[PDB]
Ligand binder design. Structure first.
Ligand code: Q85
Ligand code: Q85
Ligand code: ZN
Ligand code: ZN
Ligand code: ZN
Ligand code: ZN
Lengths: 153, 153
């Protein structure tokens, strides 16, 4: 029923297209698409609070966290609304994204429309790493590509 | 309150930053910022329906028109919600944008968040141009630059 889309671009080679679809109110959201130009392995994959790309991906601010929780993985109760874990790039540098999530929404206060989707330099340790930054950012490092999340036809 | 923002980019040299602010729910929206790389004169300036940049600015679809009206100027009863008229570039190719509008909103309904702002090749005739296209697009021609309208801090 509701479809939303994000074009990921950055200052380097990373680029992608991510689609979101929600068949019903407060239903699960299907997330799918492709990202290229990545180093092989895990890359943190988050909805950030601001749809502000004025000075590139840094303008997007922290993880989208309307419920003031700590950082976690998508399968954790203790998570930011924006915590979609990691996407995994193969040896060609391509991540084929296929996620279903029950916490993000395309309506209401969990809505991600008008926020920024970010793919990160490093793996998200899903809040299980050895330090304080783990339960804020997951230690996923710099922002390789981002886009504002928009309404699709 | 509410603040939202749009980074305009395209297939060419036009680029801009547009800020929106609404102090009160369903109150007027102040629009301000700057666009560079333009030809001297009028350039149509519209909110388009979809926040979809998948294949560039064409993916944004038609003017944002939730009430199914004909194309007009921002001061007309008879307008699309997305009809913000023209920005004017100086001989230096810079439009300093300064608009106040009571039809677009950042809340309630008529909300432009997650839609696309587009600056056009030609002047918008505000529906007064004397052909059929005037009452749909205002004959403002191709899409020089666009961006998805996002939530700001
Ligand atoms: Se959801 C959300 C989040 C932030 C700002 C606005 C909205 C919203 O609900 N906008 C209305 C809307 C959303 C999606 C679609 O897609 C068919 C249409 C209208
Ligand atoms: C921080 O800015 C925000 C402004 C508005 C909202 C919530 N708005 C909506 O879901 C909505 C739904 C239907 C029609 C119009 C709108 Se604006 C969230 C954040
Ligand atoms: Zn992040
Ligand atoms: Zn987080
Ligand atoms: Zn237009
Ligand atoms: Zn129009």
């Amino acid at each position: 029923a509701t479809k939303v889309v994000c074009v990921l671009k950055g200052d380097g080679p990373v680029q992608g297209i991510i689609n979101f679809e929600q068949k019903e109110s407060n239903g699960p959201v299907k997330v799918w698409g492709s990202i290229k130009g990545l180093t092989e392995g895990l890359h943190g994959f988050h909805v950030h609070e601001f749809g502000d790309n004025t000075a590139g991906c840094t303008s997007a601010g922290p993880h989208f966290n309307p419920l003031s929780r700590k950082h976690g993985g998508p399968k954790d109760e203790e998570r930011h609304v924006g915590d979609l874990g990691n996407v995994t790039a193969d040896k060609d540098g391509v991540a084929d994204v296929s996620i279903e999530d029950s916490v993000i929404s395309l309506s209401g206060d969990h809505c991600i429309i008008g926020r920024t989707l970010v793919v990160h330099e490093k793996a998200d340790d899903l809040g299980k790493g050895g330090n304080e930054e783990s339960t804020k950012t997951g230690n996923a490092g710099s922002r390789l590509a981002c886009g504002v999340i928009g309404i699709a036809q």
